JSON list of C-alpha atoms and ligand atoms in Angstrom, two decimals:
[
{"chain": "A", "resi": 7, "resn": "UNK", "atom": "CA", "xyz": [13.00, -9.73, 11.05]},
{"chain": "A", "resi": 8, "resn": "UNK", "atom": "CA", "xyz": [11.20, -8.76, 7.83]},
{"chain": "A", "resi": 9, "resn": "UNK", "atom": "CA", "xyz": [8.78, -5.90, 7.19]},
{"chain": "A", "resi": 10, "resn": "UNK", "atom": "CA", "xyz": [6.42, -5.12, 4.32]},
{"chain": "A", "resi": 11, "resn": "UNK", "atom": "CA", "xyz": [5.61, -1.47, 3.66]},
{"chain": "A", "resi": 12, "resn": "UNK", "atom": "CA", "xyz": [1.89, -0.73, 3.28]},
{"chain": "A", "resi": 13, "resn": "UNK", "atom": "CA", "xyz": [2.61, 2.62, 1.59]},
{"chain": "A", "resi": 14, "resn": "UNK", "atom": "CA", "xyz": [4.14, 1.10, -1.55]},
{"chain": "A", "resi": 15, "resn": "UNK", "atom": "CA", "xyz": [2.41, 1.87, -4.85]},
{"chain": "A", "resi": 16, "resn": "UNK", "atom": "CA", "xyz": [0.17, 0.97, -6.69]},
{"chain": "A", "resi": 17, "resn": "UNK", "atom": "CA", "xyz": [-2.19, 0.26, -3.78]},
{"chain": "A", "resi": 18, "resn": "UNK", "atom": "CA", "xyz": [-1.26, 2.74, -1.04]},
{"chain": "A", "resi": 19, "resn": "UNK", "atom": "CA", "xyz": [-2.63, 2.15, 2.46]},
{"chain": "A", "resi": 20, "resn": "UNK", "atom": "CA", "xyz": [-2.11, 5.14, 4.76]},
{"chain": "A", "resi": 21, "resn": "UNK", "atom": "CA", "xyz": [0.42, 8.02, 4.35]},
{"chain": "B", "resi": 9, "resn": "UNK", "atom": "CA", "xyz": [15.27, 5.08, -22.48]},
{"chain": "B", "resi": 10, "resn": "UNK", "atom": "CA", "xyz": [15.14, 1.91, -20.38]},
{"chain": "B", "resi": 11, "resn": "UNK", "atom": "CA", "xyz": [13.55, 1.57, -16.95]},
{"chain": "B", "resi": 12, "resn": "UNK", "atom": "CA", "xyz": [16.26, 1.45, -14.31]},
{"chain": "B", "resi": 13, "resn": "UNK", "atom": "CA", "xyz": [17.74, 3.04, -11.21]},
{"chain": "B", "resi": 14, "resn": "UNK", "atom": "CA", "xyz": [16.68, 6.64, -10.50]},
{"chain": "B", "resi": 15, "resn": "UNK", "atom": "CA", "xyz": [14.38, 6.74, -13.53]},
{"chain": "B", "resi": 16, "resn": "UNK", "atom": "CA", "xyz": [10.93, 8.25, -13.15]},
{"chain": "B", "resi": 17, "resn": "UNK", "atom": "CA", "xyz": [8.66, 5.66, -14.75]},
{"chain": "B", "resi": 18, "resn": "UNK", "atom": "CA", "xyz": [5.04, 6.17, -15.79]},
{"chain": "B", "resi": 19, "resn": "UNK", "atom": "CA", "xyz": [2.81, 3.10, -16.18]},
{"chain": "B", "resi": 20, "resn": "UNK", "atom": "CA", "xyz": [-0.75, 2.28, -17.15]},
{"chain": "B", "resi": 21, "resn": "UNK", "atom": "CA", "xyz": [-1.90, -0.78, -15.25]},
{"chain": "B", "resi": 22, "resn": "UNK", "atom": "CA", "xyz": [-4.76, -3.20, -14.69]},
{"chain": "B", "resi": 23, "resn": "UNK", "atom": "CA", "xyz": [-4.89, -5.10, -11.41]},
{"chain": "B", "resi": 24, "resn": "UNK", "atom": "CA", "xyz": [-6.57, -8.50, -11.31]},
{"chain": "B", "resi": 25, "resn": "UNK", "atom": "CA", "xyz": [-7.04, -10.93, -8.44]},
{"chain": "B", "resi": 26, "resn": "UNK", "atom": "CA", "xyz": [-8.44, -14.36, -9.35]},
{"chain": "B", "resi": 27, "resn": "UNK", "atom": "CA", "xyz": [-10.16, -12.83, -12.39]},
{"chain": "B", "resi": 28, "resn": "UNK", "atom": "CA", "xyz": [-11.71, -9.84, -10.64]},
{"chain": "B", "resi": 29, "resn": "UNK", "atom": "CA", "xyz": [-10.46, -6.62, -12.23]},
{"chain": "B", "resi": 30, "resn": "UNK", "atom": "CA", "xyz": [-9.99, -4.76, -8.95]},
{"chain": "B", "resi": 31, "resn": "UNK", "atom": "CA", "xyz": [-8.32, -1.53, -10.07]},
{"chain": "B", "resi": 32, "resn": "UNK", "atom": "CA", "xyz": [-7.17, 0.43, -13.13]},
{"chain": "B", "resi": 33, "resn": "UNK", "atom": "CA", "xyz": [-5.34, 3.69, -13.74]},
{"chain": "B", "resi": 34, "resn": "UNK", "atom": "CA", "xyz": [-2.01, 5.41, -14.25]},
{"chain": "B", "resi": 35, "resn": "UNK", "atom": "CA", "xyz": [0.92, 6.27, -11.97]},
{"chain": "B", "resi": 36, "resn": "UNK", "atom": "CA", "xyz": [4.51, 7.47, -11.95]},
{"chain": "B", "resi": 37, "resn": "UNK", "atom": "CA", "xyz": [7.15, 6.28, -9.50]},
{"chain": "B", "resi": 38, "resn": "UNK", "atom": "CA", "xyz": [10.85, 6.71, -8.79]},
{"chain": "B", "resi": 39, "resn": "UNK", "atom": "CA", "xyz": [12.49, 3.41, -9.71]},
{"chain": "B", "resi": 40, "resn": "UNK", "atom": "CA", "xyz": [14.91, 1.79, -7.27]},
{"chain": "B", "resi": 41, "resn": "UNK", "atom": "CA", "xyz": [13.78, 3.60, -4.12]},
{"chain": "B", "resi": 42, "resn": "UNK", "atom": "CA", "xyz": [11.36, 0.97, -2.80]},
{"chain": "B", "resi": 43, "resn": "UNK", "atom": "CA", "xyz": [8.34, 3.03, -3.90]},
{"chain": "B", "resi": 44, "resn": "UNK", "atom": "CA", "xyz": [6.71, 0.29, -5.96]},
{"chain": "B", "resi": 45, "resn": "UNK", "atom": "CA", "xyz": [6.03, -3.28, -4.89]},
{"chain": "B", "resi": 46, "resn": "UNK", "atom": "CA", "xyz": [9.15, -5.47, -5.43]},
{"chain": "B", "resi": 47, "resn": "UNK", "atom": "CA", "xyz": [7.56, -7.98, -7.82]},
{"chain": "B", "resi": 48, "resn": "UNK", "atom": "CA", "xyz": [6.11, -5.37, -10.16]},
{"chain": "B", "resi": 49, "resn": "UNK", "atom": "CA", "xyz": [9.37, -3.43, -10.04]},
{"chain": "B", "resi": 50, "resn": "UNK", "atom": "CA", "xyz": [11.52, -6.45, -10.87]},
{"chain": "B", "resi": 51, "resn": "UNK", "atom": "CA", "xyz": [9.23, -7.04, -13.84]},
{"chain": "B", "resi": 52, "resn": "UNK", "atom": "CA", "xyz": [9.74, -3.46, -14.98]},
{"chain": "B", "resi": 53, "resn": "UNK", "atom": "CA", "xyz": [13.55, -3.48, -14.81]},
{"chain": "B", "resi": 54, "resn": "UNK", "atom": "CA", "xyz": [15.13, -2.88, -18.21]},
{"chain": "B", "resi": 55, "resn": "UNK", "atom": "CA", "xyz": [11.86, -2.26, -20.05]},
{"chain": "B", "resi": 56, "resn": "UNK", "atom": "CA", "xyz": [11.60, 0.31, -22.85]},
{"chain": "B", "resi": 57, "resn": "UNK", "atom": "CA", "xyz": [9.02, 3.03, -23.48]},
{"chain": "B", "resi": 58, "resn": "UNK", "atom": "CA", "xyz": [5.96, 1.47, -25.09]},
{"chain": "B", "resi": 59, "resn": "UNK", "atom": "CA", "xyz": [6.47, -2.16, -24.06]},
{"chain": "B", "resi": 60, "resn": "UNK", "atom": "CA", "xyz": [3.38, -4.05, -22.92]},
{"chain": "B", "resi": 61, "resn": "UNK", "atom": "CA", "xyz": [3.50, -7.17, -20.76]},
{"chain": "B", "resi": 62, "resn": "UNK", "atom": "CA", "xyz": [1.82, -9.25, -18.05]},
{"chain": "B", "resi": 63, "resn": "UNK", "atom": "CA", "xyz": [3.09, -9.90, -14.53]},
{"chain": "B", "resi": 64, "resn": "UNK", "atom": "CA", "xyz": [2.20, -12.35, -11.77]},
{"chain": "B", "resi": 65, "resn": "UNK", "atom": "CA", "xyz": [3.14, -11.09, -8.32]},
{"chain": "B", "resi": 66, "resn": "UNK", "atom": "CA", "xyz": [2.98, -13.37, -5.25]},
{"chain": "B", "resi": 67, "resn": "UNK", "atom": "CA", "xyz": [2.13, -11.95, -1.82]},
{"chain": "B", "resi": 68, "resn": "UNK", "atom": "CA", "xyz": [5.79, -12.32, -0.83]},
{"chain": "B", "resi": 69, "resn": "UNK", "atom": "CA", "xyz": [6.78, -9.74, -3.44]},
{"chain": "B", "resi": 70, "resn": "UNK", "atom": "CA", "xyz": [3.58, -7.70, -3.13]},
{"chain": "B", "resi": 71, "resn": "UNK", "atom": "CA", "xyz": [2.28, -6.64, 0.29]},
{"chain": "B", "resi": 72, "resn": "UNK", "atom": "CA", "xyz": [3.50, -9.66, 2.23]},
{"chain": "B", "resi": 73, "resn": "UNK", "atom": "CA", "xyz": [1.64, -12.11, 4.48]},
{"chain": "B", "resi": 74, "resn": "UNK", "atom": "CA", "xyz": [-1.53, -11.44, 6.45]},
{"chain": "B", "resi": 75, "resn": "UNK", "atom": "CA", "xyz": [-0.62, -11.31, 10.13]},
{"chain": "B", "resi": 76, "resn": "UNK", "atom": "CA", "xyz": [-3.61, -12.58, 12.15]},
{"chain": "B", "resi": 77, "resn": "UNK", "atom": "CA", "xyz": [-2.36, -10.41, 15.03]},
{"chain": "B", "resi": 78, "resn": "UNK", "atom": "CA", "xyz": [-3.24, -7.47, 12.80]},
{"chain": "B", "resi": 79, "resn": "UNK", "atom": "CA", "xyz": [-6.90, -8.30, 13.42]},
{"chain": "B", "resi": 80, "resn": "UNK", "atom": "CA", "xyz": [-7.98, -6.65, 16.67]},
{"chain": "B", "resi": 81, "resn": "UNK", "atom": "CA", "xyz": [-11.21, -5.77, 18.47]},
{"chain": "B", "resi": 82, "resn": "UNK", "atom": "CA", "xyz": [-11.78, -2.16, 19.51]},
{"chain": "B", "resi": 83, "resn": "UNK", "atom": "CA", "xyz": [-14.69, -0.43, 21.30]},
{"chain": "B", "resi": 84, "resn": "UNK", "atom": "CA", "xyz": [-17.24, 1.39, 19.12]},
{"chain": "B", "resi": 85, "resn": "UNK", "atom": "CA", "xyz": [-16.90, 4.43, 21.39]},
{"chain": "B", "resi": 86, "resn": "UNK", "atom": "CA", "xyz": [-13.31, 4.99, 20.25]},
{"chain": "B", "resi": 87, "resn": "UNK", "atom": "CA", "xyz": [-14.58, 6.07, 16.83]},
{"chain": "B", "resi": 88, "resn": "UNK", "atom": "CA", "xyz": [-15.43, 9.65, 15.73]},
{"chain": "B", "resi": 89, "resn": "UNK", "atom": "CA", "xyz": [-18.91, 10.66, 16.87]},
{"chain": "B", "resi": 90, "resn": "UNK", "atom": "CA", "xyz": [-20.31, 11.26, 13.38]},
{"chain": "B", "resi": 91, "resn": "UNK", "atom": "CA", "xyz": [-18.47, 8.65, 11.33]},
{"chain": "B", "resi": 92, "resn": "UNK", "atom": "CA", "xyz": [-19.96, 5.61, 9.60]},
{"chain": "B", "resi": 93, "resn": "UNK", "atom": "CA", "xyz": [-18.45, 2.59, 11.35]},
{"chain": "B", "resi": 94, "resn": "UNK", "atom": "CA", "xyz": [-19.27, -0.20, 8.88]},
{"chain": "B", "resi": 95, "resn": "UNK", "atom": "CA", "xyz": [-17.39, -2.98, 7.04]},
{"chain": "B", "resi": 96, "resn": "UNK", "atom": "CA", "xyz": [-14.88, -1.59, 4.54]},
{"chain": "B", "resi": 97, "resn": "UNK", "atom": "CA", "xyz": [-14.72, 1.80, 6.23]},
{"chain": "B", "resi": 98, "resn": "UNK", "atom": "CA", "xyz": [-11.18, 3.11, 6.69]},
{"chain": "B", "resi": 99, "resn": "UNK", "atom": "CA", "xyz": [-9.81, 4.96, 9.72]},
{"chain": "B", "resi": 100, "resn": "UNK", "atom": "CA", "xyz": [-6.52, 5.59, 11.51]},
{"chain": "B", "resi": 101, "resn": "UNK", "atom": "CA", "xyz": [-5.23, 4.54, 14.92]},
{"chain": "B", "resi": 102, "resn": "UNK", "atom": "CA", "xyz": [-2.61, 6.37, 16.98]},
{"chain": "B", "resi": 103, "resn": "UNK", "atom": "CA", "xyz": [-0.88, 6.03, 20.35]},
{"chain": "B", "resi": 104, "resn": "UNK", "atom": "CA", "xyz": [2.15, 7.20, 22.34]},
{"chain": "B", "resi": 105, "resn": "UNK", "atom": "CA", "xyz": [4.32, 5.89, 19.49]},
{"chain": "B", "resi": 106, "resn": "UNK", "atom": "CA", "xyz": [3.15, 8.90, 17.49]},
{"chain": "B", "resi": 107, "resn": "UNK", "atom": "CA", "xyz": [2.74, 6.79, 14.36]},
{"chain": "B", "resi": 108, "resn": "UNK", "atom": "CA", "xyz": [-0.67, 6.86, 12.64]},
{"chain": "B", "resi": 109, "resn": "UNK", "atom": "CA", "xyz": [-1.42, 3.39, 11.26]},
{"chain": "B", "resi": 110, "resn": "UNK", "atom": "CA", "xyz": [-4.42, 2.71, 8.99]},
{"chain": "B", "resi": 111, "resn": "UNK", "atom": "CA", "xyz": [-7.16, 0.12, 9.49]},
{"chain": "B", "resi": 112, "resn": "UNK", "atom": "CA", "xyz": [-10.19, -1.34, 7.74]},
{"chain": "B", "resi": 113, "resn": "UNK", "atom": "CA", "xyz": [-13.35, -2.16, 9.67]},
{"chain": "B", "resi": 114, "resn": "UNK", "atom": "CA", "xyz": [-14.17, -5.83, 9.18]},
{"chain": "B", "resi": 115, "resn": "UNK", "atom": "CA", "xyz": [-17.25, -6.46, 11.32]},
{"chain": "B", "resi": 116, "resn": "UNK", "atom": "CA", "xyz": [-19.39, -4.61, 13.84]},
{"chain": "B", "resi": 117, "resn": "UNK", "atom": "CA", "xyz": [-20.90, -6.69, 16.65]},
{"chain": "B", "resi": 118, "resn": "UNK", "atom": "CA", "xyz": [-22.64, -4.67, 19.35]},
{"chain": "B", "resi": 119, "resn": "UNK", "atom": "CA", "xyz": [-20.04, -2.53, 21.09]},
{"chain": "B", "resi": 120, "resn": "UNK", "atom": "CA", "xyz": [-17.26, -4.64, 19.59]},
{"chain": "B", "resi": 121, "resn": "UNK", "atom": "CA", "xyz": [-15.67, -3.54, 16.32]},
{"chain": "B", "resi": 122, "resn": "UNK", "atom": "CA", "xyz": [-13.36, -5.94, 14.48]},
{"chain": "B", "resi": 123, "resn": "UNK", "atom": "CA", "xyz": [-10.69, -4.09, 12.52]},
{"chain": "B", "resi": 124, "resn": "UNK", "atom": "CA", "xyz": [-7.84, -5.19, 10.24]},
{"chain": "B", "resi": 125, "resn": "UNK", "atom": "CA", "xyz": [-4.44, -3.49, 10.25]},
{"chain": "B", "resi": 126, "resn": "UNK", "atom": "CA", "xyz": [-3.16, -5.66, 7.40]},
{"chain": "B", "resi": 127, "resn": "UNK", "atom": "CA", "xyz": [-2.94, -4.25, 3.90]},
{"chain": "B", "resi": 128, "resn": "UNK", "atom": "CA", "xyz": [-6.21, -4.85, 1.99]},
{"chain": "B", "resi": 129, "resn": "UNK", "atom": "CA", "xyz": [-4.24, -7.07, -0.40]},
{"chain": "B", "resi": 130, "resn": "UNK", "atom": "CA", "xyz": [-2.02, -8.71, 2.22]},
{"chain": "B", "resi": 131, "resn": "UNK", "atom": "CA", "xyz": [-1.97, -12.41, 1.40]},
{"chain": "B", "resi": 132, "resn": "UNK", "atom": "CA", "xyz": [-3.26, -12.13, -2.16]},
{"chain": "B", "resi": 133, "resn": "UNK", "atom": "CA", "xyz": [-1.45, -12.86, -5.41]},
{"chain": "B", "resi": 134, "resn": "UNK", "atom": "CA", "xyz": [-1.71, -9.96, -7.85]},
{"chain": "B", "resi": 135, "resn": "UNK", "atom": "CA", "xyz": [-1.93, -10.21, -11.63]},
{"chain": "B", "resi": 136, "resn": "UNK", "atom": "CA", "xyz": [-0.94, -7.18, -13.69]},
{"chain": "B", "resi": 137, "resn": "UNK", "atom": "CA", "xyz": [-1.55, -5.88, -17.19]},
{"chain": "B", "resi": 138, "resn": "UNK", "atom": "CA", "xyz": [1.19, -3.29, -17.59]},
{"chain": "B", "resi": 139, "resn": "UNK", "atom": "CA", "xyz": [2.05, -0.71, -20.25]},
{"chain": "B", "resi": 140, "resn": "UNK", "atom": "CA", "xyz": [5.22, 1.36, -19.96]},
{"chain": "B", "resi": 141, "resn": "UNK", "atom": "CA", "xyz": [4.01, 4.83, -20.93]},
{"chain": "B", "resi": 142, "resn": "UNK", "atom": "CA", "xyz": [7.05, 7.03, -20.37]},
{"chain": "B", "resi": 143, "resn": "UNK", "atom": "CA", "xyz": [10.59, 6.87, -18.97]},
{"chain": "B", "resi": 144, "resn": "UNK", "atom": "CA", "xyz": [12.46, 10.02, -17.96]},
{"chain": "B", "resi": 145, "resn": "UNK", "atom": "CA", "xyz": [15.35, 11.00, -15.72]},
{"chain": "B", "resi": 146, "resn": "UNK", "atom": "CA", "xyz": [14.57, 12.16, -12.20]},
{"chain": "B", "resi": 147, "resn": "UNK", "atom": "CA", "xyz": [15.19, 15.75, -11.11]},
{"chain": "B", "resi": 148, "resn": "UNK", "atom": "CA", "xyz": [17.56, 16.58, -8.23]},
{"chain": "B", "resi": 149, "resn": "UNK", "atom": "CA", "xyz": [14.50, 17.48, -6.13]},
{"chain": "B", "resi": 150, "resn": "UNK", "atom": "CA", "xyz": [12.97, 14.07, -6.80]},
{"chain": "B", "resi": 151, "resn": "UNK", "atom": "CA", "xyz": [16.17, 12.24, -5.82]},
{"chain": "B", "resi": 152, "resn": "UNK", "atom": "CA", "xyz": [16.41, 14.42, -2.72]},
{"chain": "B", "resi": 153, "resn": "UNK", "atom": "CA", "xyz": [12.87, 13.52, -1.69]},
{"chain": "B", "resi": 154, "resn": "UNK", "atom": "CA", "xyz": [13.18, 9.91, -2.85]},
{"chain": "B", "resi": 155, "resn": "UNK", "atom": "CA", "xyz": [9.78, 10.19, -4.49]},
{"chain": "B", "resi": 156, "resn": "UNK", "atom": "CA", "xyz": [8.48, 11.18, -7.92]},
{"chain": "B", "resi": 157, "resn": "UNK", "atom": "CA", "xyz": [6.84, 14.59, -8.26]},
{"chain": "B", "resi": 158, "resn": "UNK", "atom": "CA", "xyz": [3.04, 14.18, -8.52]},
{"chain": "C", "resi": 24, "resn": "UNK", "atom": "CA", "xyz": [1.46, -6.47, 12.22]},
{"chain": "C", "resi": 25, "resn": "UNK", "atom": "CA", "xyz": [0.31, -4.33, 13.69]},
{"chain": "C", "resi": 26, "resn": "UNK", "atom": "CA", "xyz": [-1.62, -4.54, 16.96]},
{"chain": "C", "resi": 27, "resn": "UNK", "atom": "CA", "xyz": [-3.42, -2.11, 19.16]},
{"chain": "C", "resi": 28, "resn": "UNK", "atom": "CA", "xyz": [-1.92, -1.87, 22.71]},
{"chain": "C", "resi": 29, "resn": "UNK", "atom": "CA", "xyz": [-4.13, -0.32, 25.40]},
{"chain": "C", "resi": 30, "resn": "UNK", "atom": "CA", "xyz": [-0.88, 0.17, 27.38]},
{"chain": "C", "resi": 31, "resn": "UNK", "atom": "CA", "xyz": [-0.80, 3.67, 25.89]},
{"chain": "C", "resi": 32, "resn": "UNK", "atom": "CA", "xyz": [-3.99, 5.55, 25.16]},
{"chain": "C", "resi": 33, "resn": "UNK", "atom": "CA", "xyz": [-4.91, 4.58, 21.57]},
{"chain": "C", "resi": 34, "resn": "UNK", "atom": "CA", "xyz": [-7.46, 6.74, 19.77]},
{"chain": "C", "resi": 35, "resn": "UNK", "atom": "CA", "xyz": [-9.09, 6.77, 16.34]},
{"chain": "C", "resi": 36, "resn": "UNK", "atom": "CA", "xyz": [-9.76, 9.52, 13.80]},
{"chain": "C", "resi": 37, "resn": "UNK", "atom": "CA", "xyz": [-11.43, 9.31, 10.40]},
{"chain": "C", "resi": 38, "resn": "UNK", "atom": "CA", "xyz": [-9.57, 11.61, 8.01]},
{"chain": "D", "resi": 25, "resn": "CL", "atom": "CL1", "xyz": [7.26, 7.51, -6.21]}
]
């Protein structure tokens, strides 16, 4: 399995 | 002072995709805590204060692939009564999992709303114009929180 | 990544 985190800078999606 | 583990790094950046200057600005991040996209972080490793460079970041080292299963259809009635439900509009979805996950409205067709859970840049290759502004040591608080202090 | 799952009771807010 492999996950990409959408909260990583510079373009943050969510929080 | 060189960019490296546990350093708080401040950068000025310009984001381009296929020639379109999408975004500009300035941020600080805690280096080596998975706070910045891998590709851009790898490019920053070892850099000194003041250095200016360019960086090409593939989707693999940016925000990953674009899962087509991330594109779902939801009823228009599930949206807030007085919210603009149009393409590009951003909302959040939540269930028994208790984890709020963000979405972008793609298309609105009758009572059917097509939304995208993928990152807006998922699948794109990013080009960066980067300037290392400042490099300082992180405070104990910052290391404790695993994030830079905004 | 990720999908919607009516097998709960998914809702939507706009904050
Ligand atoms: Cl950070």
